[PDB]
Amino acid sequence: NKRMNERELVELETAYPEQVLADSPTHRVGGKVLDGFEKYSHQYPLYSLQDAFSREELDAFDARVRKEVAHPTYICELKIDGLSISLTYEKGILVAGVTRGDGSIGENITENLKRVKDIPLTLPEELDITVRGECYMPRASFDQVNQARQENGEPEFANPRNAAAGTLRQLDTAVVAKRNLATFLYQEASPSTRDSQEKGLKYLEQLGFVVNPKRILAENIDEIWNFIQEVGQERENLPYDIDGVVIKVNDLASQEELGFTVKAPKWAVAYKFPA
Amino acid sequence: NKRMNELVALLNYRELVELETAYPEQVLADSPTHRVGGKVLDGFEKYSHQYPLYSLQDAFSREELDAFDARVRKEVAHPTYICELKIDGLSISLTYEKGILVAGVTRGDGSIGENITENLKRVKDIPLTLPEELDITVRGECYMPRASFDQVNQARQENGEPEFANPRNAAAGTLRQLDTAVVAKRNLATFLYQEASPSTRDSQEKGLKYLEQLGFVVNPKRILAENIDEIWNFIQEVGQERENLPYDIDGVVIKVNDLASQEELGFTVKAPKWAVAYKFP
Numbered sequence: 001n002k003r004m005n006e007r008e009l010v011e012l013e014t015a016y017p018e019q020v021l022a023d024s025p026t027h028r029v030g031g032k033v034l035d036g037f038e039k040y041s042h043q044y045p046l047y048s049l050q051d052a053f054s055r056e057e058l059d060a061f062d063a064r065v066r067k068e069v070a071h072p073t074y075i076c077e078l079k080i081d082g083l084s085i086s087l088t089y090e091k092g093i094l095v096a097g098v099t100r101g102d103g104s105i106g107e108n109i110t111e112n113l114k115r116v117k118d119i120p121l122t123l124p125e126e127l128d129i130t131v132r133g134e135c136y137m138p139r140a141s142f143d144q145v146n147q148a149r150q151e152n153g154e155p156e157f158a159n160p161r162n163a164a165a166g167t168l169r170q171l172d173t174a175v176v177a178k179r180n181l182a183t184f185l186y187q188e189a190s191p192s193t194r195d196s197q198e199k200g201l202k203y204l205e206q207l208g209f210v211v212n213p214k215r216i217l218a219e220n221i222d223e224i225w226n227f228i229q230e231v232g233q234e235r236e237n238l239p240y241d242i243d244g245v246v247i248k249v250n251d252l253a254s255q256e257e258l259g260f261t262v263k264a265p266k267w268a269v270a271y272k273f274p275a
Numbered sequence: 276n277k278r279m280n281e282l283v284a285l286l287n288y289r290e291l292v293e294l295e296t297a298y299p300e301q302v303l304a305d306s307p308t309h310r311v312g313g314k315v316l317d318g319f320e321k322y323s324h325q326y327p328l329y330s331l332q333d334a335f336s337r338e339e340l341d342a343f344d345a346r347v348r349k350e351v352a353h354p355t356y357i358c359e360l361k362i363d364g365l366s367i368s369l370t371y372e373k374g375i376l377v378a379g380v381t382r383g384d385g386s387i388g389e390n391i392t393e394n395l396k397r398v399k400d401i402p403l404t405l406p407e408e409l410d411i412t413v414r415g416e417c418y419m420p421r422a423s424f425d426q427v428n429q430a431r432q433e434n435g436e437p438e439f440a441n442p443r444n445a446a447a448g449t450l451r452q453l454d455t456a457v458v459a460k461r462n463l464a465t466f467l468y469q470e471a472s473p474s475t476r477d478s479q480e481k482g483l484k485y486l487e488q489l490g491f492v493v494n495p496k497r498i499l500a501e502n503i504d505e506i507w508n509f510i511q512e513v514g515q516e517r518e519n520l521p522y523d524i525d526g527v528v529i530k531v532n533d534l535a536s537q538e539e540l541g542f543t544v545k546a547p548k549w550a551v552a553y554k555f556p
């Protein structure tokens with residue numbers, strides 16, 4: 001134990017497989033090919049976003065929110081175009097990485113997710129916490145990957161989002177390890193530790209998770225609209241794809257009383273870019 | 276406005292003081308001048324605790340420690356106990372808002388304390404700011420290390436003021452007088468033991484590590500014990516090495532470790548039912 005606690009590791013790990021370290025750098029490199037994925041039932045339901053296609057619909061959301069909240073502050077984030085995932089930590093160790101699936105049942109892809117270098121294997125405190133976000137492939141890497149799909153006699157990936165989702169849904173961990181996939185976490189799925197979405201993001205960063213930094217707090221739809229317009233202009237130059245901007249009521253208690261439909265928060269909407 | 280942040284973060288000084296003396300209502304929260312001699316007060320402002328302090332039931336013998344473990348096991352079949360030192364010091368509550376220390380307060384009558392915020396700023400171990408913008412109240416003891424006490428007493432002697440009887444008199448004496456510059460010269464320190472605002476972690480032990488992440492000093496001298504017998508060994512070893520500790524202690528506080536368990540036992544009128552302090556002489 002004290003052995004591994006401090007190429008040698010590999011030998012010791014293949015010897016007593018019954019006792020690899022959670023923090024082992026060995027989980028970042030090629031491991032097993034898996035049978036299939038187990039199905040996993042989500043402890044906390046992974047809801048969806050209501051969509052908006054126009055400034056008027058954003059006006060309409062804002063008016064619906066101010067039916068219950070007098071002075072809302074909104075946080076507008078990017079909607080990353082990738083594969084949506086959920087990560088469960090127990091005692092500060094990542095135990096289950098799972099696809100959103102239908103919002104109730106997903107595929108347990110935990111082994112595959114350990115080879116996304118951005119994902120923390122352990123946390124700095126002994127937490128139980130479930131986080132959500134999107135796993136994706138940078139535009140930079142896409143061209144390379146698609147060359148590798150051809151040389152292996154497989155269909156090229158239609159775009160980065162498909163390349164990431166098809167990487168995480170195939171069965172060989174060692175393939176995940178050779179593509180450079182990354183993450184942006186946007187939320188706790190387990191009850192929020194902090195008072196505000198903007199504080200949750202800063203907290204998640206304190207835990208070791210990558211949080212997307214292009215985001216603002218805004219008081220009205222006019223400030224929001226500009227940010228969506230600045231996003232629309234810069235988006236050819238981002239190093240990942242997006243498919244929109246998410247606007248949320250910042251404060252937890254405000255979100256609380258707005259509540260949820262059977263599908264989505266009442267306190268959030270997702271703007272979608274024209275074609 | 277901007278030379279400030281640059282000057283404060285670099286320095287983290289001559290100019291800075293000058294700008295600060297120029298524009299007093301823009302001295303930044305983590306300015307290093309908060310550590311140095313500053314204002315004198317005329318008297319302390321009152322402050323009403325948002326979370327009032329309670330007290331501790333006490334025990335004075337092994338038998339009594341056993342009766343405690345028995346009352347606890349009426350409710351929780353398999354308790355874990357955390358065992359901590361009860362430091363001989365002065366009780367402080369520290370309230371942060373937006374990550375900044377905004378009040379430091381004495382126990383007072385339990386609902387209303389004395390605002391000693393400026394004096395506490397000169398205690399170096401206390402963070403002026405946190406690594407996130409939290410609203411949080413933390414509660415601990417401010418004490419004087421025995422080594423400082425022996426220095427300060429030598430200083431008072433050469434300056435012909437009378438010596439403090441013990442580190443506890445010395446600590447209450449420094450913090451309760453009105454000159455921040457006296458606090459700065461005297462080398463006080465802290466150990467925090469709880470969140471006074473509602474716990475963020477689900478065990479005392481996870482609670483303690485959490486505070487350490489936030490920049491607070493926490494006494495390493497503790498254990499997680501599964502029955503009165505490891506507890507009693509720990510206290511005996513503590514009694515024995517007591518003379519060799521860098522600070523004075525008033526005993527051992529034994530607490531039911533996990534929050535759900537503390538919540539099921541609850542409190543009497545004045546005190547938790549989930550905690551006891553064993554008193555040494």
Ligand SMILES: NC(=O)c1ccc[n+]([C@@H]2O[C@H](COP(=O)(O)O)[C@@H](O)[C@H]2O)c1
Nearest residue numbers: 304305373374375404405406407408409
């Ligand atoms: N201005 C402050 O020092 C202040 C106050 C509250 C939170 N924070 C957060 O902490 C960071 C600075 O580090 P520390 O406060 O841990 O020294 C800031 O960049 C900020 O995000 C800072």
Ligand SMILES: COc1nc2nc(N)nc(N)c2nc1C
Nearest residue numbers: 047048049077078079186246268
């Ligand atoms: C509040 O719920 C959500 N918030 C989100 N935020 C970002 N940035 N991206 C998402 N995909 C997202 N999805 C959901 C369901």
Ligand SMILES: COc1nc2nc(N)nc(N)c2nc1C
Nearest residue numbers: 329330331359360361468528550
């Ligand atoms: C459970 O409440 C308490 N716990 C404590 N813990 C330690 N270590 N020291 C104290 N002085 C203390 N005081 C109280 C009221």
